[PDB]
């Protein structure tokens, strides 16, 4: 299947006006060149392939940095280097959740790959065997980690991956997980119904999607005990929508985000650079 | 004889004449209807009011002037206090509708402006605080029958409490995206030397067969003057625009005690 | 084991890459779908739909909803009433709209660009309007006798609102770019009175149109890229 | 199971697919869907609009 | 299919004169040995295989040499030595590009191919853990990185790969990309009309394929942070045009390059050696 | 050998992966089943 | 050898299996086994039960 | 969908391909095509030159 | 996984090999082909 | 194979009552 070919077509003095319309109707504009000026035959034999939603998504997107460490904890703050949690989201980033925006709905299958990367903190604390990573989905519900080496680790039903440093960059696939028949890009609504004279507090309650999202958490350890040399580690997450079916189209995010609502930036609210005049080429 | 300027909408009791229509809207190309066996899930027997609820509900009309920056609804919440809709939607957990909207708008040969109907399924919008985000009260979120106006400046609070509201800013249509795009929702234009109404017709949107109506709005309903009122003679002068909503293939799931939202 | 020999490319992560990979949660009964109004199948279907052109972004309109009307009036003047290069992708005033934002998720495009024109007077205002463009290569046009010499419509106003000029495909290569470009570059729409609007006493004497885009049945984009559009502090 | 397929033409072309996972959601991306309607989205009317008609009669 | 044999002939004595012709007519000479000699019957088994424009082509060819580092930079100059752009091209180097020249037009895809190589900058900074390298395919209008970390590096739609050090060299295929129906080697003309009386100015414009082609950037870093250890990269660019056709042939280059165009250099412009007389064996 | 090209996911251990794998010890004779009372198939018989 | 069976389905369908190895403990996880029988738990009565019955007559 | 051709002799002859990817780019060098027609180059000329006939008549 | 082993030139890179290997630009819609005067199949039709 | 649909059914006025019955028996 190809875009449109153009016909042959000459001039025409006609009752018939394809020129004119009235698009208080909510109908865009629908004419043609054949409609408006003298047309050659002109054979389309190129393809709409490459905007397909499949094609348009069909790219893993970078959604996260995280960050690791392994050394010799010796404070609360420094234990809790030692591994780290993050609530699995999109909305860290900008350039995937502006596209998947686009749309109000959305239903795909997920791959996930991570790319890992180290480096020595310093010099002369020698050296660090190769280290292992787990990467374990944490699904609403299931216990956190407090500690690097606690007993959640032992994943007996969370999914995790062990990572080899040095090794392929780990990828797997998550089916639709949704709760409801699609994703929600949008979400105009709350969590619960706040009801008239209930104690419960309606000063600092929240708005939107953020109020009934919830994909679970990624935790990340490095498996080794402390080397002599402290690591530090960053893990870049990302993601692929593959298998996809999106519903409702939306005019594109014009300006900056300033978190994972709709919410703008009294700074940042200008995109257009005006011009010198109407006339301007 | 017949003509797409002269149409005639009756559902239930209410029927609505008008003499310059400029065709109608089927959201999507897509016709309301009861949900099937084969998509459902609450398992309960549905109430299913028919005409008690499926009928015409007339809004306070609002005033459009050289200076308005327009008008926002969301759908079901403009019609939560509305006969037997209301009653329907607050004793039961779930609700799904689809809409007839239709916009009133006349003026004369002399006047002229054009008002942008747009209908948004999920139409979230920005708060107005920097020390948030995401942060509206329900009672904000959910004026009723009266509705919101836009403004064409962002002004957020200097304290988080006071900013708990939209930040509906006209030309990023309350949301971050520009309102010159707003034309990829289902929508018309009344443009006054043509038009003096526009006619929605909406099935029910959502990624769910049915959902709580009381926390949850499926459509917004923006009304833009996308060029301003202008009379000559007076060019203070008012028009009315008034809205009047029939909720249609309305379905409610979960009976139990009436639902009575807060009001502060 | 079977005999392999592992080719370049081996254990390489291309983000464009299109394999099999195993599921973490194996087993897993996704949620029935449903009909839901509103599917998209392609990004070319959004690039079809009108969109407004902000065409009077001028300082102190520029960000504000009277970016959007074009000024008329019935002073009969010469001058033109716009002028805007076909440069979908990259043109200040192009670039924000619907066709605009899809198009900056590309390199390439091709086929013709349809502008819509909502005239927005009184019932009582007549008028006569030339729409052209003016493939590339000669002196863009600022009267209304050069603009008349290239593809153009003559728009009468009255009971049907709307009027529609093409940008016919005319290019030499078989796609533009997606930026600003000499070689792809796409020629000049202008507009000039025909005639004057006319109006009787007790009307408005200034009044605005409106300027829609969208891509025809024949327009199509290849090279999917990032989008200069969306940024974010690191 | 080896599904046969034609290629995406190139500079001048059949490939073999065969699925590895018992989940659909570990396979490679769906293959083109060239489907469109945009009239749902460009024309989304009750009654009938021909070009060639007046807009409003 | 062979090059030609040889049929058994005898001497003529004959108004047929095939060893004289006319090259004014544009016609080179046609004759062949059994024309003018005496000859015996040859079977030729012999094949033109290797002389196939996809056997002339069939190489991975180096076309450039990138520079990265990684280290803890604290000054501009440094901080832009953690990432390197590259515009994508085959004039970088001489070899392939004078194959490709043999040519007017061509249409191929192409084979991409990288090695990666590193040094330790210095001895007495202790060590570097195994880098992962990023190689970013930044489309004309995508945006450009400014440092090593930006947002740009997501790479949501851009194609990036992502290499560790000591792995295969990677590898991809990259289609016919051209916008016109074939690559142009060589551009007569300009990217656009200079008008008469225009304010434009035409005293630094330029002449040829330089104005009009563009396939884009090639952007690296090394995604690691830095070690206490400075290291240095390189990466080759390897290509090798695949299903390959070329139109309209041309003499190769007889003197050395002097940029991206066909301009000569006054010291090297007498590529032959003299001989002693016309009549030196 | 045949040539191949290592993919991303390459060497990992997911814990809900699926493979096969080699035995520790082949040709092992499993006890025969018997019938035992109260069989489980689904821990949605224990929810009922 | 290779069995081809229905993948579980995902957002929007068959997949290859053929084993490798000598002994049925090397091979992948059990097809989906849907055997339910919650009455030997649940009503594991010597006399039927009918609900719209009396449960003690 | 295998693809079974004719090797390239040596020294003293089959050889199998399987298409992996979906885009032809993908692809193995093209098969060696023998293709030529050096008149297009050697003897354009309008009217047709007889080897044995002379050039200029 | 199927048994395998790794023969020698495993993890080479031969500038004279002719693999498969994956597109950055998938599912990519290559410019429709014309016909141009002068296509050349042959390096000895240029030396003929 | 699926979990249990659930039937169109209306209401009763009947001598057959589900709702009713005597856990004792270990059902
Ligand atoms: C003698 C100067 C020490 O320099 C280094 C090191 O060779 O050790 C460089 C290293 O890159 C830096 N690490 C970072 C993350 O900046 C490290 C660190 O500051 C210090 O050893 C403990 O604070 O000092
Ligand atoms: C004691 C002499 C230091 O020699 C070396 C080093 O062992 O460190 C050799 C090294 O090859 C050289 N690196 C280069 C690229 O030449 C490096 C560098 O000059 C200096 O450390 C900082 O300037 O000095
Ligand atoms: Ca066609
Ligand atoms: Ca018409
Ligand atoms: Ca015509
Ligand atoms: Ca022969
Ligand atoms: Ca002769
Ligand atoms: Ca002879
Ligand atoms: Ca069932
Ligand atoms: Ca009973
Ligand atoms: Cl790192
Ligand atoms: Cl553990
Ligand atoms: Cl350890
Ligand atoms: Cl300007
Ligand atoms: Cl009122
Ligand atoms: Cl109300
Ligand atoms: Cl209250
Ligand atoms: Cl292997
Ligand atoms: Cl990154
Ligand atoms: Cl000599």
């Known amino acids: 299947p190809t875009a449109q070919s153009t016909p042959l077509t000459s001039g025409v003095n006609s009752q018939e006006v394809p020129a004119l319309t009235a698009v208080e109707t909510g109908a865009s504009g629908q004419a043609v060149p054949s409609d408006v000026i003298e047309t050659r035959h002109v054979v389309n034999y190129k393809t709409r392939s490459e905007s397909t939603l499949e094609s348009f998504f069909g790219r893993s997107a970078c959604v996260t940095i995280l960050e690791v460490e392994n050394f010799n904890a010796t404070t609360d703050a420094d234990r809790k280097k030692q591994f780290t949690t993050w609530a699995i989201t999109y909305t860290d980033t900008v350039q995937l959740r502006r596209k998947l925006e686009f749309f109000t709905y959305s239903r795909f299958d997920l791959e996930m790959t991570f790319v890992i990367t180290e480096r020595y903190y310093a010099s002369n604390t020698g050296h660090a065997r190769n280290q292992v990573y787990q990467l374990m989905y944490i699904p609403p519900g299931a216990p956190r980690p407090t500690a690097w080496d606690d007993y959640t680790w032992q994943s007996s039903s969370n999914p995790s991956v062990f990572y080899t440093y040095g090794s392929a960059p780990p990828r797997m696939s998550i089916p639709y997980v949704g709760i409801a028949n699609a994703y929600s890009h949008f979400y105009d609504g709350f969590a619960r119904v706040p009801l008239k004279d209930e104690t419960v507090d309606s000063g600092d309650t929240y708005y939107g999607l953020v109020t009934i999202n919830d994909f679970g958490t990624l935790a990340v350890r490095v498996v080794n005990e402390y080397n002599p040399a402290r690591i530090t580690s960053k893990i870049r997450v990302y993601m692929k929508p593959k298998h996809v079916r999106c519903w409702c189209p939306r005019p594109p995010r014009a300006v900056p985000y300033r978190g994972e609502g709709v919410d703008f930036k009294q700074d940042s609210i200008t995109p257009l650079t005006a011009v010198e005049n109407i006339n301007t080429f | ?264 | 084991g079977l005999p392999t020999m592992l080719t370049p490319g081996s254990s390489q992560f291309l983000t464009s890459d299109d394999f099999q990979s195993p599921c973490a949660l194996p087993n897993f009964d996704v949620t029935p779908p449903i009909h839901i109004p509103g599917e998209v199948f392609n990004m070319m279907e959004l690039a079809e739909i009108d969109s407004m052109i902000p065409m009077n972004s001028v300082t102190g309109k520029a960000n504000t909803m009277e970016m959007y009307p074009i000024p008329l009036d019935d002073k009969g003047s010469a001058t033109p009433i716009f002028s805007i290069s076909l440069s979908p992708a990259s043109d200040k005033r192009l670039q924000y709209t619907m066709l605009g934002e899809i198009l900056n998720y590309y390199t390439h495009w091709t086929g013709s660009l349809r502008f819509t024109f909502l005239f927005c007077g009184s019932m009582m205002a007549t008028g006569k309007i030339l729409l052209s463009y003016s493939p590339p290569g000669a002196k863009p046009p600022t009267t209304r006798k050069d603009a008349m010499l290239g593809t153009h419509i003559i728009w009468d106003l009255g009971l049907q609102s709307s009027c529609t000029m093409l940008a016919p495909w005319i290019s030499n290569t078989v796609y533009r770019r997606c930026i600003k470009d000499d070689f792809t570059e796409g020629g000049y729409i202008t507009c000039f009175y025909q005639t004057r609007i006319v109006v009787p006493s007790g009307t408005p004497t200034s009044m605005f149109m409106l300027a829609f885009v969208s891509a025809c049945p024949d327009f199509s984009v290849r090279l999917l890229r990032d989008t200069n559009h969306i940024s974010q502090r690191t | 199971g080896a599904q046969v397929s034609s290629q995406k033409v190139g500079a001048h072309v059949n490939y073999t697919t065969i699925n590895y996972y018992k989940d659909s959601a570990s396979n490679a991306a769906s293959k083109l869907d060239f489907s469109q309607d945009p009239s749902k989205f460009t024309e989304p009317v009750k009654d009938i609009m021909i070009k060639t008609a007046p807009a409003l009669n």
């Open chain 2, 1 to 264: 004889g017949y003509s797409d300027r002269v149409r005639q909408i009756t559902l239930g009791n209410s029927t609505i004449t008008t003499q310059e229509a400029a065709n109608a809207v089927v959201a999507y190309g897509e016709w309301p209807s009861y949900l099937d066996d084969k998509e459902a899930n609450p398992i309960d027997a549905p109430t299913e009011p028919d005409v008690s609820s499926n009928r015409f509900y007339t809004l306070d009309s609002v005033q459009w002037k050289s200076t308005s920056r327009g008008w926002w609804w969301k759908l079901p919440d403009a019609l939560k206090d509305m006969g037997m809709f209301g009653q329907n939607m607050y004793y039961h957990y779930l609700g799904r509708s689809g809409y007839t909207v239709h916009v009133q708008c006349n003026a004369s040969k002399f006047h002229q402006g054009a008002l942008g109907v747009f209908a948004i399924p999920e139409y979230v919008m920005a708060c107005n605080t920097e020390a948030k985000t995401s942060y509206v009260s329900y009672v904000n979120a959910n004026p009723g029958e009266k509705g919101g106006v836009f403004d064409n400046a962002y002004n957020p609070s200097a304290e988080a409490s006071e900013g708990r509201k939209f930040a509906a800013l006209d030309y990023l249509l309350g949301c971050g995206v520009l309102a010159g795009n707003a034309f990829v929702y289902p929508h018309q234009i009344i443009n006054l030397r043509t038009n003096n109404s526009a006619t929605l017709v909406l099935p029910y949107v959502n990624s769910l067969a049915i959902d709580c109506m009381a926390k949850h709005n499926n459509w917004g309903l923006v009304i833009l003057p996308l060029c301003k009122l202008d009379y000559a003679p007076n060019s203070s002068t008012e028009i009315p625009i008034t809205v009047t909503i029939a909720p249609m293939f309305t379905e409610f799931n979960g009976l139990r005690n009436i639902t009575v939202p807060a009001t502060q």
